[PDB]
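P.,

For your records, the input lines for the assembly:
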Amino acid sequence: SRSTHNEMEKNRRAHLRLSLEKLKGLVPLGPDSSRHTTLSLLTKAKLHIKKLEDSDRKAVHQIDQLQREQRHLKRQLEK
Amino acid sequence: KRAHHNALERKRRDHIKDSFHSLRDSVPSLQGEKASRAQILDKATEYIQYMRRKNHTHQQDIDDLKRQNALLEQQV
DNA sequence: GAGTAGCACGTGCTACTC
DNA sequence: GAGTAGCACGTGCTACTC
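Structure tokens returned:
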């Protein structure tokens, strides 16, 4: 009866808890004794993803600039 | 008192729900999708691992090109 | 002590599926 | 119709902060 729904929910929450702890593992989160809040984790994860994307954009851009810089040096080295 | 306690917990839950919505939309596989909280945590985890790997690989490429270039400035 | 934030439960609802 | 998935609410504790 109710012990079926109540038991399924408790198991649903546990698995969700496992997903949260894992995400907590990644992400600098905080230094020393960390905090859960669930709220602080969701916040930090979003901001970290944001940082990863900004670094990606800047890396792809510098690679392109370095490549243009390289072809110029090569053509120059010809003369 | 319970009426008020109930109202504040409801507010607290709403902020967490908004935060799940915002994380979901920061992930390029779930944005604009009806994803459960389980899917949001799992895909964000995946995306973060993916992005860290990509950014490292590009960092290498950036050092490889820097070494290659600084060595051409010499020949030049 | 008064006022909460954070959390785990036990439940009720809704939308699906066959 | 009955089972399941995912939510969100009401509630009572812990552990502060003022």
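Two observations worth noting. Chain B touches chain A through 33 residues (CB under 8 Å). Helices of chain B lie at 2-24, 37-75.

Regards
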